[PDB]
Amino acid sequence: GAMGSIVSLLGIKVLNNPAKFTDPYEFEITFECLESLKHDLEWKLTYVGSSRSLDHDQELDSILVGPVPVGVNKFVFSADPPSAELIPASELVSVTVILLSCSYDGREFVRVGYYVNNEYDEEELRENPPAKVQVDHIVRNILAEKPRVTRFNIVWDNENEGDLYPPEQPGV
C-alpha cells in the first residue's frame, strides 16, 4: 500500500507558548503513516536566524523513530535551546524561524517553519538593550498561528539508491 507519500505530516503542536529563548523547544509531532516504514524516520529541529541564519543554522536535536506502524503517529519532540552566545543581545531580539524537518533514509520530505517572536518582556530592556544578553528575560513566542509547511517529493520504499547524499561543495 503505497499511497504516494507513505508519511505525511498532519501538523505540529507548539506546546511552548509563551516561553523563553533559553527554554527547551517542545513540539508535538502528528503524522499519518500509510504503510509501515521499512526504513526509519528522522525528525529534527533547526534554528534559523530569520532566513539565511545570521546565527549559522543549528540543529538543536534530532530524533529517530522506528519501528513506525500504520496510523497516526504522535509524540512530543524536545530540542535543546540555542545559546545566545551565537546571537548577541541586539541580534536575538528579532523574529526568527524554526525548521522541523523529517528525513526518510536520507531523503527529507517535510520541513516545517515557524516564526518566533523574541523580545524583552521588560519594557526598560526592550527599549534599552543591555550589553549582555539576558535571555532569561527574553520571551520566545512561537507564531504557531502560521505553519509554513514545505513538501519535497521523494520516493518511498521502491527507490533505488544512487544520489542520497548532498554534493559536498568547498564552501568559504
Binding site: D61, I63, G71, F75, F77
Partner: peptide
C-alpha cells in the same frame, strides 16, 4: 480515534 506514541530515539542508529 487511535494514536501511536512511538518511542522516538535520539539518533542512535544501528546496522
Amino acid at each position: 480515534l487511535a494514536i501511536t506514541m512511538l518511542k522516538p530515539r535520539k539518533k542512535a542508529k544501528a546496522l
